[PDB]
Design a protein around this ligand. Sequence first.
Ligand SMILES: O=C(O)/C=C/c1ccc(Cl)cc1Cl
Ligand code: NA
Ligand code: NA
Ligand SMILES: [Zn+2]
Length: 258
Amino acid sequence: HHWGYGKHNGPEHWHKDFPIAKGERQSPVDIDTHTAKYDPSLKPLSVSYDQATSLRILNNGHAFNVEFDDSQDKAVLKGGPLDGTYRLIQFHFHWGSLDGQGSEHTVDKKKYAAELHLVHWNTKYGDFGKAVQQPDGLAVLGIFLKVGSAKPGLQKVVDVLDSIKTKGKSADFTNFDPRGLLPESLDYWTYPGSLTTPPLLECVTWIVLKEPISVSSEQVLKFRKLNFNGEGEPEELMVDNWRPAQPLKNRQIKASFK
Ligand SMILES: O=C(O)/C=C/c1ccc(Cl)cc1Cl
Ligand code: NA
Ligand code: NA
Ligand SMILES: [Zn+2]
């Protein structure tokens, strides 16, 4: 497959190789704050990242992933809408060419500069590849980035980006603490959806935090200096690696807060 984010291989094209692109529970979506309903039955969200073991950062030609050791219950997400225990496997971002776009989810059609996805898989399915074949296989914690003050806990990420400029480059990335990427509040919206890149599988419980984090214009500028291309290929800046909002169809977005 040769999918991407350009005119010729971008989201409008994806359905030909990945027909579930036009399915019933695709992501992202617009979150209409006046239609999402507070759900008193939602349990409290539990982000348990104290024992997280980061390993490596990889430019995969679509984003950069910070990868974790998920061979045991070291960094897990539980509670909220979730039954059981979801292990952190990786995080990555989606961002724009300009500060007015980049997020995949929108809020009342508002686009943020970027969006962080912390990807977890349901440990009842044993491995990640099995989990993505299940409707409750993944939980993705989504966090909006707005441009403002620098996020100190992001700076170790931006400083390593010079070493993974092009597709297929990786760097050691141990001892990174993903707690430094969270906002203060864990108030969230939740709905059932999908991966937002091919293969677009309908396996995700989305948990999108209401409170965005602020990053500096310098920090996001360094994201936009990455490359989609491999080394020694013509330079294509890694920008606008976001899928736009998809039809809500027969789904309700629930709020954890009033
Ligand atoms: O950008 C994303 O949100 C998609 C990430 C992703 C992409 C492919 C597969 Cl199999 C699994 C995952 Cl979690
Ligand atoms: Na983990
Ligand atoms: Na609205
Ligand atoms: Zn993502």
